Amino acid sequence: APSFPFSRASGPEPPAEFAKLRATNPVSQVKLFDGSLAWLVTKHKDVCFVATSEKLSKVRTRQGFPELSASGKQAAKAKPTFVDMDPPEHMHQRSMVEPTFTPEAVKNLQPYIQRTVDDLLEQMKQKGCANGPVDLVKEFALPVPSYIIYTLLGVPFNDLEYLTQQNAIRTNGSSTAREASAANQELLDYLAILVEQRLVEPKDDIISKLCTEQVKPGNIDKSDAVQIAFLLLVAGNATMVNMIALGVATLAQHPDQLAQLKANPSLAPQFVEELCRYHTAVALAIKRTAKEDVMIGDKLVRANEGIIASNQSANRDEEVFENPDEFNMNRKWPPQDPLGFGFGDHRCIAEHLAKAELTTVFSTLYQKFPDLKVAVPLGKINYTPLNRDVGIVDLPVIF
């Protein structure tokens, strides 16, 4: 049994092991950091099964849960939020914050998302690049998702820049454990204050709705509200940043596709669809423990055994997506759902918001800067370490 998680084959590539497993051993055992074994599922159909089976659990206090690191094992000791819950607890808490993320709500949020993107791009243009390239991540990919989620949560305008930087520090690869932790605890402290304030004078934001609708009636306590708000912030921000950066890098790698997008920004939705399939930046979230014996393919997963269903591998499943390793924004989509946002009950709560942010970015970025170019050879892109989910640390650009 090989050690898992695997390392990416290269900066922009997924681990090389998956393709081989899908072809000769779709459901197999892998060895985790603590020496325990877990079942690795690599085929689309099997990943979908794992994501929806009622015989599988997300509760991390169950022995056998596939924690992939020492930190994950310690983090599993805290009171859980809906991300680590099973029915009926799961939807009971998730439904407390779903309103802002529904397809209808996101459609109505479009003008705000567009203004946020327009403002950040204008700021970038005014700063210019007359003295050399600027970091697309720091100047654009980071603030876009950050400002939006912070604003939706309830953070006032003047606090956005500092809070955006602090949240970045908690996941920055250059941060020391001490710094990441400090930033983490600081964001929690700040959210605690916001909850106290919104409890007194509610405004029109997520935190206020949690206070008025859940805390006051006694459905949850203040700390619960803080943790729910915290989850909404840290769950997908870093991923959004990385997806925007990867999108720009990808377009640079395939000139004709960029030419097509520039000539027709209406193709942004399909470009985003392909991006979320090709670059599965959240590939280690579909994990479970078997509550009872369950058969998957030619294997029997016994009660209390862990399972990791790779949506990354599923998105490269040749049986579902023709020429899976080819990035094609004009891809002819099959009836099967690509799995960039998961599947089943737990499917990303912000899938629609995320897609809206990405679509707004890629339908506007090259209209603003038609000559935007990465200022370093593409082969020198600074990607996240290979033993981590795919992403980009910084991206020098000129325009």
Q: Residue 373 pairs with which residues in a beta bridge?
A: 398
Find out whether 156 and 164 touch, Cβ atoms under 8 Å: no
Is 30 or 276 the residue whose CB approaches ligand HEM more closely?
Answer: 276
Terminal C-alpha separation, the chain: 48
Of positions 6, 65, 82, 150, contacts ligand HEM by CB under 6 A: 82
Q: Which is nearer to ligand HEM, 30 or 361 (CB)?
A: 361
CB–CB of 83/345 below 8 Å? no
Q: In the complex, what is the shortest distance from the CB of residue 345 to ligand HEM, in angstroms, rounded to a whole number?
A: 7
Do 219 and 92 form a contact (C-beta atoms < 8 A)? no
Nearer to ligand HEM, 183 or 243 (CB): 243
Is residue 106 at the binding interface for ligand HEM, with CB under 6 A as the rule? no
Residue 316 makes contact with ligand HEM by CB under 6 A? no
Enumerate the known binding-site residues for heme: 348
Under the binding rule (CB under 6 A), the answer on residue 117 touching ligand HEM is: no
Give the DSSP per-residue string, 254-271: SHHHHHHHHH-GGGHHHH
Q: Which of 9, 59, 76, 83 binds ligand HEM (CB under 6 A)?
A: 83
The CA–CA distances, whole Å, from 248 to 362, 372, 399 equal 8, 9, 13
Q: Which CB, 129 or 190, lies closer to ligand HEM?
A: 190
281 is an interface residue for ligand HEM by CB under 6 A: yes
Which residues does residue 289 pair with via DSSP β-bridges, in sequence order?
57, 306
* Contact set for ligand HEM, span 196-235 (CB under 6 A): 231-232, 235
Contact with ligand HEM (CB under 6 A): which of 236, 306, 324, 391?
Answer: 236
- Burial classification of residue 326, based on how many CB atoms lie within 10 Å of its CB (0-12 exposed, 13-18 middle, 19 or more buried): exposed
Q: Burial-class residue 217 by CB neighbours within 10 Å (0-12, 13-18, 19+).
A: exposed
Nearest residue to 48 via CA among 335, 312, 389, 311 = 311
Q: Does 349 interact with ligand HEM (rule: CB under 6 A)?
A: yes
395 touches 374 (CB < 8 A): yes
Q: From the CB of 307, what's the least distance to ligand HEM, in Å?
A: 12
Q: For ligand HEM, which residue of 11, 342, 391, 396 counts as binding (CB under 6 A)?
A: 342
Q: Does 284 bind ligand HEM (CB under 6 A)?
A: no
- Tell the smallest beta-carbon distance from residue 130 to ligand HEM (Å): 33
Q: Is 358:244 a contact under the CB 8 Å cutoff? A: yes
Kindly indicate which of the ranges 72-80, 219-227, 238-246, 366-374 contains the residues binding ligand HEM, using the contact rule CB under 6 A: 238-246
SS3 assignment, position 157? helix
The amino acid occupying position 318 is E
Give the interface with ligand HEM as residue ranges (CB under 6 A). 51, 82-83, 94, 149, 231-232, 235-236, 239-240, 243, 276, 281-282, 285-286, 311, 340-344, 346-350, 353-354
